[PDB]
Amino acid sequence: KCTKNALAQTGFNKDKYFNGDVWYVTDYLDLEPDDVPKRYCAALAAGTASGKLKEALYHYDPKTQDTFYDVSELQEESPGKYTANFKKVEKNGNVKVDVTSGNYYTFTVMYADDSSALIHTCLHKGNKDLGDLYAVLNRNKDTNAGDKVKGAVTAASLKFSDFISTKDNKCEYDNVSLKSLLTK
Ligand code: HEM
């Protein structure tokens, strides 16, 4: 089950956030981790296309090399708070799983600047919650969390010590497809 009391950034700048660029998940805190251990890689590209906010998502498992993509049309609930109805797609946009009613995620930009961000996500799949997930994002995949996003982690009453770094997971990203999926 997820918390809805996540606080959106005061004076959050949509323009720089939703610029069509890629954000890398450099650290994360899964509050409801799966039973089986999984090395994780994820990146996303939030922008706009044909009049809408769009977000394209990428997950990768270094170990199995399994990869999946999702692209969603975003609905602003409030500045900094968005609901996303996703569809799983091939890297060229061919739909593998259509948009469906109990399938969607919500996120709250808790902190953001030109280079970094702290988001909270709540994944809902099949009318069921997959639990809270907080992620530290960076425009550069090799950059360590700075003092500002860390103060933001503390400010949300979390411990950065409890966050898992993806820096050593031998991650690989497909930025080209991420960006082109933005219009699919
Ligand atoms: C950066 C923000 C992220 C967002 C918005 C996000 C969103 C999602 C979405 C939409 C799905 C559904 C895929 C589909 O079925 O079409 C998914 C699945 C999955 N994600 Fe993420 N994710 C993020 C970060 C990550 C990270 C860092 C991890 C590692 C904890 C993670 C692990 C997984 C796993 C294990 C699945 C399969 C779900 C299941 O267990 O059924 N994701 N994610």
Ligand SMILES: NCCc1c[nH]cn1
């Ligand atoms: N507890 C895992 C939920 C999740 C995975 N990806 C995004 N959210």
